[model samples]
Target: TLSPELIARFTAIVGDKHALTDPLELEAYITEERNLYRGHSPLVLRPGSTEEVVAICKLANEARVALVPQGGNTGLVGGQTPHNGEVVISLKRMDKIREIDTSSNTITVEAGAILQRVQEKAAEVDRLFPLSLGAQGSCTIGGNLSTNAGGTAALAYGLARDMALGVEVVLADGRVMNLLSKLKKDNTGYDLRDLFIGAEGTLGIITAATLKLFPKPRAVETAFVGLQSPDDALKLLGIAQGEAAGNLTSFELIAETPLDFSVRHANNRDPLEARYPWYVLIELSSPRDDARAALESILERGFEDGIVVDAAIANSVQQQQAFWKLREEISPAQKPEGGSIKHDISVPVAAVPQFIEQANAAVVALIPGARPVPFGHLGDGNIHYNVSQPVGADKAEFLARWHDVSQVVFEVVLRLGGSISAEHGIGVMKRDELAEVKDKTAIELMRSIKALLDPHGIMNPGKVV
Candidate 1:
């Protein structure tokens, strides 16, 4: 429990309405998005400004109290939730878009700003912010930056790490490190801005950021292509890449089983008539008006090569959204079916098929009747390999074998020289696995840096290294 005097001190900084001690209000902060982890916190602080954040951090450091920085609380992993009665500095109140520099092709936003809002702000200026995901409507930019999130557009615009030009952070000891410059080049010294972008708040609290923006694509085309196997999808991707060139923005792979899950559980009917064993959602965007014709021409070549079985070209915006809806509904659709053992693993773009084939066989052998719903960004090689419980099987019983089953899949990833975690950072979900699989020297260096920056170990303690 937090001392009354300590609470009073924090309250003095943020005022009465901002500091939350009531259990009911605090429930939202303690519960994680996936409900995989629940935490307890003695106090929840909602700082309205950067100065207030600095004051709270200074007090926490002086008292040697652990501080957890929370953004939109939409993290799949247990990174945002407090571990042991620590103080949660919720950034939701600081939501604001500070500037949109059309000249620099950049947008400056506070950490708490909604991702969709920032995207919309860029759009209002006739530019594009391409960091898109399922939770763009609610997930905060701070969380996106902290996790270095990668979405569908990563194939073209790059990851969140690549999108950020500069960031302003409040260090653990309350010093403000403002490096929020929209510059394309800087050779001053070590890039400290990159350090805190994905640090998960272990070193400092990100307050604001300047992110890259691109000219809005005037021509966008989407197609849903059916394939016999992942190998066929790979070949199709090669053909699409060769034809589409830099216009190829996204290539997503979805297994037939997962698509069936969407139809049965999430009311997303299949758009394609004849369902193949595998499917790929290919998107092309360009400033020129020839994107659709180019994509269609490439699909013609793909069909002739016997790689693509059938294709559905989205002719209208509604048709395109309907196709995307099928892909986005996959995650929530699984909950109604049964327990889902999820893995966000990745391999070389060339080895995705092999990894899936081997990992699926291994897991199915261990748990018969298990359905592997492996799907995700095929262009970047990140696959969300999730397993559904057998029909009418005990939910708890199937979930009980999650760790053992994940180990089998992870072993395949390791053998293929792939990452156990691809885009999603090593939050509490994969911390132990990271220690087990990551290089020893790399881990040691990370720990050393953590100690040097946050000696009190108060910044999101028990996370990462």
Candidate 2:
């Protein structure tokens, strides 16, 4: 509840140009693209510098106003949006590439810098920032570090938390915690940086960070293979690991039903010659100079192993881009088809094949024509198991049945020792599920930590414990 007087004070703290209260403009910043969680906030502020953010936080603390920290507005689980009409403090205006130390292989960027922009800068300097994801064009590094995101590249380069060396965060009481040094080893006390990295805005607001970089791979290969089942994909992946050693970078799996949608609505035509029940997109990179020769050597061996049924090697850069299109267009392509139920779950690497088979079979049996569109980072056992509604079924009816479908999949995940939510944190969307699945001792410890950091429970209330 923002009074006109308090709003005026807020506007004075960061300029009138930065304050937004209009319904239309606020509407754009309030809801996530997935439409899973929608929250209200009477005022939104865009602060540009560390001083301004500190002042704004101090003012909000004095007023006892709840402030929601947001970056890029690209969070899928609703962590960036307010839960109960709290004021939103967006960092989009603070976009800047602060510094890059080539000798140390570290780059510093403001919280609002888009992931793609950072990647481009790394490329310009002959380096690589491997935090790849579907929303890289819009999602910010601050959001990725906050949620500790895991995407297709996690198996090779590790997730968001591993890439960050140090962070610049603002405490709830307006104090700055700056640790932007690129030190590889520090035997200090407990690492407070780890606490804030995955805290999801509960501990503090990440303003900027120093992230690690890797040498850009000179040679790369992309392959799409047809598989009869998830087990077959695992067999192929195991063989690739044995033959390629450390060259494998990504292993993604997509079902036939999802590929159909990607082809029909997502501007992606069939890249594979024959249709198969499952598809595995393999990517391997090397520091060697010859991309074509390096790719040919590994793929030829895979073709011989009977693991790869059908294959396509990208002869030119255009073909390489075409190979990636099938995966990049999955989510947007499914909207027109029907209602969708999505899960971000993970299992042990060895048990991934079993989990996918059992989960998909259970979901399809529960709802006829409920097209299971399971796909994602098969190398790390993290799957974006999504379901599109049956043909001719009402969208609302399908959405209403999401609970039952979710239950069926979650039950399988639990029985096989898989995570319910992998990259996406538990926002209000999975609050009840967290209570039901999380262990009592662990939940108590989390609640105790939350209380110590945010005594009033004002920071992203009703979110993860």
Task: Give the winner by TM-score.
Answer: 1
What TM-score does model 2 achieve against the real structure?
Answer: 0.95
Query: Please, what is the whole-model Cα lDDT of each candidate in the order they appear?
Result: 0.91, 0.84
lDDT of predicted model 2:
0.84
What are the TM-scores, per candidate, against the unseen true structure? 0.98, 0.95
Name the best candidate (by lDDT): 1
Extract clashing residue pairs from model 1: none
lDDT of 1 by residue, 185-225 (tens): 88998899999988988889999999998999999999999
Q: List the residue pairs that clash in candidate 2.
A: 40-85
Residue 171 C-alpha lDDT in model 2: 75
Write one digit per residue (lDDT tens) for candidate 2, span 102-197. Answer: 889999999989999999999999999988988889989888899898788787889899998999998777889998879989877878888888
